[PDB]
Design brief:
Chain A: Residues 1-248 are annotated as: Interaction with CLOCK. The complex is a heterodimer of chains A (248) and B (13). Chain A is mainly alpha-helical and 248 residues long. Chain A has 8 helices and 4 strands; from the N terminus they run αααββααβαααβ. In chain A, the strands form 2 sheets. In chain A, strands 1-2 form a two-stranded antiparallel sheet. Classes of the chains: A mainly alpha (248), B mainly alpha (13). The interface between A and B is small, with 14 and 9 residues.
């Protein structure tokens, strides 16, 4: 029988290239623009990925759409943190193999202020020495981190699916012997990082929503992101979001 | 309406 985490591991999507021509100089506008086009391709891959997570397709189609709309930024930022954490010990952002933002590229105007919220994720993964298995359980949990004010059409089932992946995160923590007040502290620490993603996403979405809405900025978003953003902007103004937390 | 997202969930793959 295959374990649940091994099933999350085989569906881990391939690395996408940004298509960034480095023979041309950098600019903040050029990088932000390239990243949005990459972001849309990465979100399309996250849809294919979500559909293969055991249990996810059993939710009402409207709930599948809802979870993907609420969590896309959280999934994008968490996965970027992982790639950055695995790339080097240095303070870099590995957006793609052809677009790595080093300390020299961070000197670009307004670059550091958007990049620091993203650098926090890899910093926490380095500091907590997060494993591949813990990451895979945590990333699936980030997909199930927000729900509508009045919940989902398959809420009962969602709470069951969510519980299963919380238990799965527990199993990965224990697999790193370990035991026992040491384990409770690992669960505390990792679920605290999961909770802080809501704050990371809030900062990322402020940039995202502003650059989308202000057409004088000339910052393009592909169909995939434009659609999700158009749908999500009113949901953040009508309080139609219940951000799930492990620690109150 | 989330046309692309619905399409990607409804399509095969
Ligand atoms: C408004 C946002 C920043 C949002 C934010 O939250 N601000 C951080 C400052 C933090 N404080 C603590 C001071 C507060 C800033 C940061 C990067 C800025 C773009 C780029 O430069 C390139 C380009 C230059 C043009 O000429 C004008 C258009 C354009 C597209 C710019 C538009 C806008 O200006 C952006 C999105
Ligand atoms: C700071 C924000 C947050 C950014 C996103 C953070 C998460 C992410 C990780 C990636 O691997 C590729 C693209 C995305 C999905 C992203 F990097 C781009 O889309 C650009 C983005 C929205 C942003 O830079 C803009 O608002 C630019 O308009």
């Amino acid at each position: 029988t295959p374990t649940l985490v091994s099933l999350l591991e085989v569906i881990e999507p391939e690395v996408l290239y940004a298509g960034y021509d480095s023979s041309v100089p950098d600019s903040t506008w050029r990088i932000m623009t390239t990243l949005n086009m990459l972001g849309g391709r990465q979100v399309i891959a996250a849809v294919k990925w979500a559909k293969a997570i055991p249990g996810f397709r059993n939710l009402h189609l409207d709930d599948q759409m809802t979870l993907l709309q609420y969590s896309w930024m959280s999934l994008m930022a968490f996965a970027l943190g992982w790639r950055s954490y695995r790339q080097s010990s240095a303070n870099l952002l590995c957006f793609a193999p052809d677009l790595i933002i080093n300390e020299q590229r961070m000197t670009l105007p307004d670059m550091y202020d958007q990049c620091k919220h993203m650098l926090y994720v890899s910093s926490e993964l380095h500091r907590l020495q997060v494993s591949y298995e813990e990451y895979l359980c945590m990333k699936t949990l980030l997909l199930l981190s927000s729900v509508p004010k009045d919940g989902l059409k398959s809420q009962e089932l969602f709470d069951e699916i969510r519980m299963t992946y919380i238990k799965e995160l527990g199993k990965a923590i224990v697999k790193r012997e370990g035991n026992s007040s040491q384990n409770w502290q690992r669960f505390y620490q990792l679920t605290k990082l999961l909770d802080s993603m809501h704050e990371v996403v809030e900062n990322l979405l402020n940039y995202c929503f502003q650059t989308f809405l202000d057409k004088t900025m000339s910052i393009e978003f592909p169909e995939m992101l434009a659609e999700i953003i158009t749908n999500q902007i009113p949901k953040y103004s009508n309080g139609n979001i219940k951000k799930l937390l492990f620690h109150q | 309406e989330n046309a692309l997202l619905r399409y990607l969930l409804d399509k095969d793959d």
